[PDB]
Amino acid sequence: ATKIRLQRHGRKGYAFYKIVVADSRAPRDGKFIERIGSYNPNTNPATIDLNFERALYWIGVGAQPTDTARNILSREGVLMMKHLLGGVKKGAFDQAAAENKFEAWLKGKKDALNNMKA
Amino acid sequence: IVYNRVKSTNDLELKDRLVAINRVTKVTKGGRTFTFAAIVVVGNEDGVIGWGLGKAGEVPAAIAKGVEAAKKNLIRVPVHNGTIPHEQAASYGGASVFLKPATTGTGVKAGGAMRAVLDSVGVTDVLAKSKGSSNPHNLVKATIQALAEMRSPLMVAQNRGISVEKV
Amino acid sequence: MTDPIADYLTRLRNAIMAGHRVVSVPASNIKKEITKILFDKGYILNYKFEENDSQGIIKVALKYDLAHKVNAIKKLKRVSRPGLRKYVGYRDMPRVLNGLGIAIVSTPRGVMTDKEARELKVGGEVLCYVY
Amino acid sequence: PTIQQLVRKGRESFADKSKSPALNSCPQRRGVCVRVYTTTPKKPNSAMRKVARVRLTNSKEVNAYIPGEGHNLQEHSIVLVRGGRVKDLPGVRYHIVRGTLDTAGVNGRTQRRSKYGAKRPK
Amino acid sequence: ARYTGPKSKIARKFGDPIFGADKVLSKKNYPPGQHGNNRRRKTSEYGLQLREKQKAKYTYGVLEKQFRHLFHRAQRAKGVTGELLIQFLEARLDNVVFRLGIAPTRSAARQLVSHRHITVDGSVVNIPSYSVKPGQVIGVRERSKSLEVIADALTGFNHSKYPWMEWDQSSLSGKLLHMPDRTDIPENIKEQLIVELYSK
RNA sequence: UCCCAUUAGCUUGUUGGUGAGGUAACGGCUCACAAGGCGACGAUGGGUAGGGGAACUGAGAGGUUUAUCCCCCACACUG
RNA sequence: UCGCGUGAAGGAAGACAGUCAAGGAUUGUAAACUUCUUUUAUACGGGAAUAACGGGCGAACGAGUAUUGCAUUGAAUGUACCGUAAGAAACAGCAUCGGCUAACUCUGCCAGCAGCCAUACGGAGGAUGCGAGCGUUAUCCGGAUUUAUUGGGUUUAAAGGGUGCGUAGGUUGUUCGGUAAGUCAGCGGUGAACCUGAGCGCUCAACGUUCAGCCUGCCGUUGAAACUGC
RNA sequence: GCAGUAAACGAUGAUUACUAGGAGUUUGCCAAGCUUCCACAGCGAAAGCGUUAAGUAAUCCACCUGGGGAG
RNA sequence: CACUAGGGUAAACCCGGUGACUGGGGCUAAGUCGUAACAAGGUAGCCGUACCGGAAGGUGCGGCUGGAAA
Ligand SMILES: [K+]
Ligand SMILES: [K+]
Ligand SMILES: [Mg+2]
Ligand SMILES: [Mg+2]
Ligand SMILES: [Mg+2]
Ligand SMILES: [Mg+2]
Ligand SMILES: [Mg+2]
Ligand SMILES: [Mg+2]
Ligand SMILES: [Mg+2]
């Protein structure tokens, strides 16, 4: 079936993934129907770039994401039923405010004194 | 056709460059007679440039005679800044040369006789090609006549009778 | 006759090389347009159209620089010959003598020079180079 | 030619030929020496050059010049043949690689050692 | 690789003491070898261009491949090719340290950089070919601010007169203002010859 | 979309029609009137080769090759 | 392919090699003082791993949160301390082209060419390229315009058919009016990685990655009528 | 009746238009249409060509791509 | 019972190899016999064609100047 997955595209020791929509029988780094984003797991904030409208369209027509692609989609907020609501409308989830959650955690800096009095 | 110039006593900036030294032979009953011929290009780093051939029995004497003849035979070339107004092709004997203006930071893309001629005339931005024989006499003369056939926009407007040809 | 435009250019070139002052050519519409373009650009001193019983005669008076005894025209070159026709767009219009010459070109808006052809954004057949 | 003539026929280009065709585009070849003999140079040169008739693995006969001072080559010796032609010698367009297979390095060499397969002196 | 050979040989061969000031350059102004100071055979223009290129390379401690890449960079960059080449040569980290006066010679600066006594923007950088950009801060590492050699080199260097370098002795650091002009650079290298040699 | 004319004629399901059968599907795809079809704008035959994007190279035009990478095709000891 | 090291700053003209009493190797060596990139030994040691599964919470199924466990590489990055210049430079040239010089030997040889049997052969001393490489061979491209549309020629250098008629084909005086095949213009569609300006990350760099600038071919559809075609 | 070659040569393919002067010469009325020698510009490596071009241009055909082997 | 891979048979074609014997060519030296060409090369040279000679060559017929002398 049509799938949403990642193609490994960096170099040795530095993995960079291209989030694509591809047929399941295609080679891992080969043919793909469409490209919808990129994923850099080396950075601690775990850099993600995604095309929201196209990802939502592919989920709507029924592309099956892999585990990591599904996690990325959930983190970006594609996985929602706000459009599924048949009894409500204009249901602003506003969960992006909580999903910001800026983790500005740093490390204290210490120095060694140079006691070379000679 | 050549602009020409009198002995440049005031314009005494004429640096002299050497193109080629040849040891020609003449045969007689006693044996062989050897001489030396030098091609000398004098230039003031401006449109003034001259060429001469000096023949003697010694290299310094040949070079001096070439310098004298080059000083006697002088012309003026319409060069603006360090480039040439337009492209120009020329032929002289078996030598054919082609010069094209280039960008400001390009230098001189030529070697040998053409490079010596261009240095003497003070052109520092040009692409030059030789599509014939590499003879020094003919190469020097063909390059000089290519330079002499040039025309600046002012001269083009002058002999066309108009002022601005959308330049 | 195989190329009347090339013949007209050759007549002009031979008259210039010989040093004549007036050259007479058989007349044609495209040749009249070329003569008008030459007069407008300032390459020839004057011209006159004579309508006799034949197709007519174009009489061209050439322009010489009295200061230097040099004709206003130096090179005339036919580009699009019958054996090899050449058409260009307005983007790829040729530039003659680094913009110091002209390229007579026939366009759907008429016969003009490459400068106004580029200005009006029209291409066509490159008749000749003049400088 | 005219444009119509070129349309009808066109132009022809001819590929060049290898200067050392018996190598078959291989940089070197293995061979067996048939006869190790001595030859005379052309008119302006006088010497006694050492040449070998070599049968390559691709079943080709070549004349290979043995360089350096002295050699240990005999008949039925396995040698390595590379390209390169000697000017005065006619018909000798190959060289024997010294210091490989049966042929050894030139003894007593100190300069240009790598061209004659001589190990670095201790 | 590094040259790591005798320096007075190169100094005498080129005349100019490019490695600083030495007592050997006096009473000896001939190229090394038994054929020195035997007049001066006419060297060609190509030989002069080659000797200028070698002078630049021995001055800045750069090998031929890196020098060719630097010339390619200058050609790609916008400006005068020779001036850009000299600016790129002077923008190297070891040269910047030497101009800041942390080390007496360019080789001493390179040794300090390699042995990790120099910090760039607060982080240890040990590549001697590192290209310093204007606005960056190059200073002594905090763990080696009391080195005897560094202290001696800075002793008497209270001038710090280079216009394109701002020195702060309190922080034991310095900053680069802008790329100096070729006339401001105090090197006798004729970059024009190198340019024509590498372009022809 | 490669060379050879020291390869000039090739073709009898072959070109078209009627009908039937068959196939996922149109069709001489197969099976039971007419003589047509293709050919110096190179048919037929012979030789050679997997084809592109890349890559390299050159100012450009162009040239070389498809090793690694991607797309399409062909094949799995021989039928 | 890229990057780094094989030490840094002082030190007079030792010994031994070469040339001519003095040049040169040479501040080179030996001495004395700093440093430890990198080897060696010890210790701390990431990131590549994010969801899992099992608990919840708004409710009728999907999602949204909170947790446990999960690293082949792996004593690899990085960090820190011992004591140490210690463990780390070769290869090809040196008669002209071409950057580099003199002695001792002598057919042996060398060789890209001019050619040399000695500023060219072999060794010694020096010098010059490059440098963890340096040379040789093989193959391809450019200069090479030596297949020339761009961009060559044919009296004598290679090159006009012995001469005509003529089939196909190629080219077509002048003018008026149509058409729109060639030609010109507008709009739309289509055309990973690599390659070009700007960034960002690899301590730099190769490289990786993002974005702006190429789409300059093909197809469809609207107009123009100077030129070629009909 | 075959054969189909030559220093079968102007060692120079056929058309069209244009561009200086001199000296001769054949033909029908100064002037064509020819047929021969010096010679401007221009061309050419030069010898040379130069209105009967090897000059200036356009159309089409033939032919060349180092020598020998080898027609 | 058709259909067919494969088998045998014959032919003819194409592609290769080898063979008693018998012919050119290239290259290297120079043994042998002459002197054909280059000067009017001692009979001007060359082109085509025919006949003939140990060989370069000779002669006949027509042509050309890429020949002196005149
Ligand atoms: K017409
Ligand atoms: K005849
Ligand atoms: Mg390296
Ligand atoms: Mg000939
Ligand atoms: Mg003829
Ligand atoms: Mg003939
Ligand atoms: Mg004779
Ligand atoms: Mg005779
Ligand atoms: Mg007889």
GROMACS .gro file of C-alpha atoms (C1' of nucleotides) in nm, chain H residues 6-71:
model
   66
 1053A      C1'    1   4.577   1.094  -7.152
 1054A      C1'    2   5.040   1.638  -6.881
 1055A      C1'    3   4.169   1.438  -7.198
 1056C      C1'    4   4.583   2.109  -6.898
 1057G      C1'    5   4.406   2.720  -6.831
 1058A      C1'    6   4.709   2.121  -6.391
 1059U      C1'    7   4.166   2.673  -6.262
 1060G      C1'    8   3.327   2.293  -6.256
 1061A      C1'    9   2.868   2.548  -6.417
 1062U      C1'   10   2.547   2.990  -6.366
 1063U      C1'   11   2.438   3.536  -6.201
 1064A      C1'   12   2.553   4.043  -6.075
 1065C      C1'   13   2.932   4.412  -5.972
 1066U      C1'   14   3.451   4.651  -5.966
 1067A      C1'   15   4.051   5.075  -6.264
 1068G      C1'   16   4.384   5.186  -6.642
 1069G      C1'   17   4.726   5.107  -7.070
 1070A      C1'   18   4.893   4.811  -7.584
 1071G      C1'   19   4.725   4.516  -7.980
 1072U      C1'   20   4.357   4.223  -8.258
 1073U      C1'   21   3.878   3.952  -8.557
 1074U      C1'   22   3.390   4.055  -8.688
 1075G      C1'   23   2.844   4.361  -8.806
 1076C      C1'   24   2.762   4.921  -8.693
 1077C      C1'   25   3.177   5.516  -8.142
 1078A      C1'   26   3.017   5.060  -7.980
 1079A      C1'   27   2.911   4.577  -7.865
 1080G      C1'   28   3.034   4.006  -7.923
 1081C      C1'   29   3.522   3.798  -7.899
 1082U      C1'   30   4.038   3.667  -7.898
 1083U      C1'   31   4.596   3.799  -7.675
 1084C      C1'   32   4.993   4.078  -7.331
 1085C      C1'   33   5.146   4.484  -6.895
 1086A      C1'   34   4.880   4.613  -6.487
 1087C      C1'   35   4.481   4.989  -5.961
 1088A      C1'   36   4.205   4.813  -5.556
 1089G      C1'   37   4.171   4.353  -5.375
 1090C      C1'   38   4.341   3.849  -5.317
 1091G      C1'   39   4.772   3.506  -5.231
 1092A      C1'   40   5.280   3.151  -4.854
 1093A      C1'   41   5.508   3.322  -5.272
 1094A      C1'   42   5.553   3.267  -5.788
 1095G      C1'   43   5.161   3.541  -5.926
 1096C      C1'   44   4.580   3.652  -6.066
 1097G      C1'   45   4.373   4.102  -6.186
 1098U      C1'   46   3.676   4.270  -6.603
 1099U      C1'   47   3.836   3.594  -7.011
 1100A      C1'   48   4.004   3.706  -6.161
 1101A      C1'   49   4.299   3.323  -5.845
 1102G      C1'   50   3.881   4.029  -5.658
 1103U      C1'   51   3.359   4.134  -5.432
 1104A      C1'   52   2.905   3.821  -5.335
 1105A      C1'   53   2.468   3.434  -5.406
 1106U      C1'   54   2.294   2.896  -5.594
 1107C      C1'   55   2.405   2.383  -5.706
 1108C      C1'   56   2.746   1.969  -5.821
 1109A      C1'   57   3.255   1.710  -5.780
 1110C      C1'   58   3.672   1.628  -5.474
 1111C      C1'   59   4.074   1.654  -5.015
 1112U      C1'   60   4.218   1.533  -4.474
 1113G      C1'   61   5.065   1.309  -4.343
 1114G      C1'   62   5.399   0.964  -4.662
 1115G      C1'   63   5.468   0.447  -4.807
 1116G      C1'   64   5.193  -0.015  -4.845
 1117A      C1'   65   4.840   0.111  -5.290
 1118G      C1'   66   4.505   0.246  -5.700
   0.00000   0.00000   0.00000
